[PDB]
Scaffold this active site. Structure first.
Site, mmCIF file in Angstrom:
data_model
loop_
_atom_site.group_PDB
_atom_site.id
_atom_site.type_symbol
_atom_site.label_atom_id
_atom_site.label_comp_id
_atom_site.label_asym_id
_atom_site.label_seq_id
_atom_site.Cartn_x
_atom_site.Cartn_y
_atom_site.Cartn_z
ATOM 1 N N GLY A 14 0.767 -1.234 0.000
ATOM 2 C CA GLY A 14 0.000 0.000 0.000
ATOM 3 C C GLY A 14 0.800 1.288 0.000
ATOM 4 N N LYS A 15 2.118 1.165 -0.046
ATOM 5 C CA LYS A 15 3.056 2.285 -0.049
ATOM 6 C C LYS A 15 2.766 3.331 -1.149
ATOM 7 C CE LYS A 15 6.925 0.578 -1.053
ATOM 8 N NZ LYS A 15 7.636 1.068 -2.256
ATOM 9 N N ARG A 42 12.461 3.387 -13.242
ATOM 10 C CA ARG A 42 13.084 2.168 -13.748
ATOM 11 C C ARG A 42 12.391 1.743 -15.024
ATOM 12 N NH1 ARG A 42 10.018 -2.560 -13.769
ATOM 13 N NH2 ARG A 42 9.683 -2.419 -11.498
ATOM 14 N N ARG A 157 10.204 -11.386 -5.972
ATOM 15 C CA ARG A 157 10.728 -10.019 -5.916
ATOM 16 C C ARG A 157 10.560 -9.461 -4.506
ATOM 17 N NH1 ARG A 157 8.913 -4.856 -9.538
ATOM 18 N NH2 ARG A 157 7.955 -6.616 -10.643
ATOM 19 N N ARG A 219 -27.424 16.815 -4.382
ATOM 20 C CA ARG A 219 -27.890 18.119 -3.941
ATOM 21 C C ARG A 219 -29.302 17.910 -3.431
ATOM 22 N NH1 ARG A 219 -27.716 21.530 -9.340
ATOM 23 N NH2 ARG A 219 -28.219 23.339 -8.031
ATOM 24 N N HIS A 220 -29.776 18.887 -2.666
ATOM 25 C CA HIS A 220 -31.139 18.920 -2.141
ATOM 26 C C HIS A 220 -32.042 18.872 -3.378
ATOM 27 C CE1 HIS A 220 -31.015 22.694 -4.182
ATOM 28 N NE2 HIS A 220 -29.918 23.001 -3.509
ATOM 29 N N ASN A 226 -34.499 27.904 -7.216
ATOM 30 C CA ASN A 226 -33.958 27.134 -8.340
ATOM 31 C C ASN A 226 -34.752 27.434 -9.598
ATOM 32 O OD1 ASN A 226 -32.680 23.923 -7.023
ATOM 33 N ND2 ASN A 226 -31.685 25.905 -7.389
ATOM 34 N N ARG A 269 -33.443 23.519 2.223
ATOM 35 C CA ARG A 269 -33.547 22.637 1.070
ATOM 36 C C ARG A 269 -32.909 21.253 1.277
ATOM 37 N NH1 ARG A 269 -30.630 27.013 0.258
ATOM 38 N NH2 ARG A 269 -28.737 27.293 -1.006
ATOM 39 N N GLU A 289 -24.143 25.982 1.226
ATOM 40 C CA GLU A 289 -23.751 26.411 -0.116
ATOM 41 C C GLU A 289 -22.795 27.587 -0.093
ATOM 42 O OE1 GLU A 289 -22.852 25.561 -2.743
ATOM 43 O OE2 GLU A 289 -24.317 25.768 -4.335
ATOM 44 N N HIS A 354 -25.111 21.029 -1.733
ATOM 45 C CA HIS A 354 -25.403 21.984 -2.779
ATOM 46 C C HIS A 354 -24.464 21.848 -3.983
ATOM 47 C CE1 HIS A 354 -27.807 23.873 0.415
ATOM 48 N NE2 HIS A 354 -26.717 23.915 1.163
#
Ligand SMILES: CCCCCCCCO[C@@H]1O[C@H](CO)[C@@H](O)[C@H](O)[C@H]1O
Ligand SMILES: CCCCCCCCO[C@@H]1O[C@H](CO)[C@@H](O)[C@H](O)[C@H]1O
Ligand SMILES: CCCCCCCCO[C@@H]1O[C@H](CO)[C@@H](O)[C@H](O)[C@H]1O
Ligand SMILES: CCCCCCCCO[C@@H]1O[C@H](CO)[C@@H](O)[C@H](O)[C@H]1O
Lengths: 432, 432
Positions: A14-15, A42, A157, A219-220, A226, A269, A289, A354
């Site tokens: 995980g490095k 490499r 390896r 979003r709401h 709107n 909202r 928002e 939002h």
């Protein structure tokens, strides 16, 4: 003083995954950072397939190549931090021996950097075994290779690193700043955090994980302002915005999710869209928002009329320039740092927020540039399901079958301070 | 009766290269043809790397897979020729034994097809050795594989075919139609050509080669009717068109070419451009610019005025529809078949021709569809150097530093028969 982060760990622990998340997070919050993957150097230098033999400690040819690739990477770290204005360089390589670690540390010391080690150690069987499959299916090193032959080869390896491997010690390395992550997100050992930046890197690193889960962003439902094509304010839901909430609750149910945590902002909202679900929700003002300042509740038409200069300058750089008394998307990203952090920590979560807030969140998980962020598409009545993966994060857009207005305003072609109102408002969706 | 072409030969003997050229040529001259590469079917089915062992005659797993891939390919040949309207199907596979060849022949016989064999046999060392390198650097089978290991492996795969390999015999196969190509373009043995199509396939196949060379394509220098924006006619060179000829001669010299053969049409503009070179040229009327019939020497403006219906219909399908008494690009391709054939036979050659003629030639070597062909870009005072390669054919555009008018007319957006003249002539370059 710039900071040199030195990854440490066995291959497939995980490095690199951590190296990427850390580089992304640091860049998102505005700390210029770049990672340097020695394995990629490499690959670029040899340009031909290499078996495990290439990685043997007695292999004089592979030894010279890995050694010159490592020095090339470090030269670049130096160029970035001392010539290009970089703040943090992440040196991604196994760096499994004390001798090596002490060289890199002296490299930092000679160049006036503060060095901080990040060791990744997996012991969880499923994690380790899955990582090898992830490496076998996604590493350019194992393309067009037989499954069993590739696995066996990589297996050998890792052995090449395991025998002289020395984890960071409690006593031997008591004078070094570092953090040891045991099985991503499970346990940690931290030593001598030297400054503020290392403190924040630790805080971030101690909060990420790989537990399978999904982040639901939406979003709401369609609001009152709107329909009017008005920005900001504190409207309530519209007839279609209510129609959505009900489609959202059903969606969340049909999804049949394990302990779903729901969040909303302090705005009516979002709260009313949440109130339609079965499950409980938590509201935060940090999720409110973006602030449009003096342009709150106006239409774009009205903005062009009262603030044509600020409107054109905002169109020129929508990430940095703000309306008077308002916030810029850059301001919003910073405000949203605690949200970023908590979304990392959470497992299954739904955020009803939002448009501008959602763009910042999508830009984080999908790794979009600051320039593109203010223009990401976050349609109404659509749920964006993000699923963090090995490569990055997949995204599925789910339209919840309810009609809604379009609030997405493309950047107009003419952004001149001396432009006609018709050209400034040409990319506006229908409104009223 | 449809025709089934059966490739025959060892791996890396040019079998696929010939299969491609033949499919391309046949399609270019309007004979619907498709090739079926059994190796590609195998790749799509297994989706994993396979060593030479997979190809061993005793390998029961690889034997079943290669056998079902071969049957899948033949099913598709059947679908194409008996259901999709195909005329010629090229079965690309080693087909190295008589048993196999007799099965395929019976497949053709059961489906009412005429079968014709095309065997490729290399013996020339350099050819054979280069083919393996071409296979090693371009085959998807040998990606991310060690050089020596890949070569050795393929080497052993060829062996898998060599031991039971039986070339087409003079006596054993006296009742089969076929052509044996010994070292692409060197020698041939032909037996029982059954019909007209096999006769033409043989004629084409007996004229292609792989001798390194380049095809130089360029239009005559800027002419008189060019400046006037007039099409067709028999103008002479313009001041810039003369200025080009001199840049062309120098170019040809600086190129220092081995026995360059030059061709032109029976039109003054090509002939005068050729007259400026050191080397001799040959003129042919088959190379004359496309015939615009009643629209000869007109400008597009004038065409829109006298023939608006034909002009809009030509814009709808520029490959097939023609001006009254004129030629279509489809007519031109056919007229240019002897040119195609000779360009294949030639080595280093320079063709000073015209825009429409040049589009047809570029479409041949670059394998562009009939739909795109009439719209290929063939700018004045530019030399298009084509160099046939293993994969296909590379192209380099060389502008010979002399200004010239633009004669390229894009397809306008409105191609309605009932369109305004302004919309029909909107994509016209400057003219007069
Ligand atoms: C900053 C100096 C970097 C030196 C890179 C040396 C490259 C040789 O690779 C070496 O492979 C060994 C496998 O057992 C590891 O234990 C060593 O740590 C590693 O450096
Ligand atoms: C997307 C949803 C993320 C919501 C982020 C909530 C962040 C927590 O917000 C506040 O932060 C303070 C900081 O110490 C704590 O003391 C408070 O208890 C906490 O409520
Ligand atoms: C139309 C029938 C096609 C049958 C395909 C059989 C696939 C088995 O592959 C066989 O490999 C041998 C290698 O020595 C070759 O000699 C055979 O010709 C080949 O068919
Ligand atoms: C691009 C230049 C290609 C020119 C093609 C020239 C084709 C030859 O044209 C004519 O074809 C006849 C066909 O049998 C021959 O008898 C004539 O000798 C030959 O001149």
């Amino acid at each position: 003083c710039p900071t040199l982060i030195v990854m440490v760990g066995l291959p497939a622990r995980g490095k690199t995954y951590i190296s990427k998340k850390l580089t992304r997070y640091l860049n998102f919050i505005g700390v210029p950072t770049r990672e340097f993957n020695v394995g990629q150097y490499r690959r670029d230098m040899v340009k031909t397939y290499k078996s495990f033999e290439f990685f043997l400690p007695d292999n004089e040819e592979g030894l010279k190549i890995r050694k010159q690739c490592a020095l090339a990477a470090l030269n670049d770290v130096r160029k970035f931090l001392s010539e290009e204005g970089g703040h943090v360089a992440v040196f991604d390589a196994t760096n499994t021996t004390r001798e090596r670690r002490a060289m890199i540390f002296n490299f930092g010391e000679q160049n006036g950097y503060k060095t901080f080690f990040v060791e990744s150690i997996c012991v969880d069987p499923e994690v380790i075994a899955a990582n090898i499959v992830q490496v076998k299916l996604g590493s350019p090193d194992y393309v067009n290779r037989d499954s069993d032959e590739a696995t066996e080869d990589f297996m050998r390896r890792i052995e090449c690193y395991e025998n002289s491997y020395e984890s960071l010690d409690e006593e031997q390395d008591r004078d070094l700043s570092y953090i040891k992550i045991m099985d991503v997100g499970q346990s940690y050992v931290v030593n001598r955090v030297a400054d503020h930046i290392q403190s924040r890197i630790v805080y971030y690193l101690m909060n990420i994980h790989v537990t399978p889960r999904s982040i639901y962003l939406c979003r709401h439902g369609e609001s009152e302002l709107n329909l009017k094509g008005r920005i900001g304010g504190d409207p309530g839901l519209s007839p279609r915005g209510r129609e959505f909430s009900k489609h959202l609750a059903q969606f969340i149910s049909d999804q049949n999710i394990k302990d779903l945590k729901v969040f909303t902002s302090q705005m009516k909202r979002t709260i009313q869209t949440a109130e339609a679900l079965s499950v409980p929700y938590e509201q935060f003002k940090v999720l409110n928002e973006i602030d449009a300042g003096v342009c709150e509740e106006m239409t774009y038409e009205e903005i062009q009329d009262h603030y044509p200069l600020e409107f054109a300058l905002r169109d020129q750089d929508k990430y940095r320039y703000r309306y008077p008394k308002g916030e810029s998307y850059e301001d919003l990203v910073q405000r949203l740092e605690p949200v970023i952090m908590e979304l990392e920590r959470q497992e299954n979560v739904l955020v009803i927020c939002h448009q501008a807030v959602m763009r910042c969140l999508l830009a984080y998980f999908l790794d979009k540039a600051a320039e593109e962020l203010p223009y990401l598409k976050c349609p109404l009545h659509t749920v964006l399901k993000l699923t963090p993966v090995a490569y990055g994060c997949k995204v599925e857009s789910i339209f919840l079958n309810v009609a809604a207005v379009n609030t997405h305003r493309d950047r107009p072609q003419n952004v001149d301070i001396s432009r006609p109102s018709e050209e400034a408002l040409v990319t506006v969706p229908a409104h009223q």
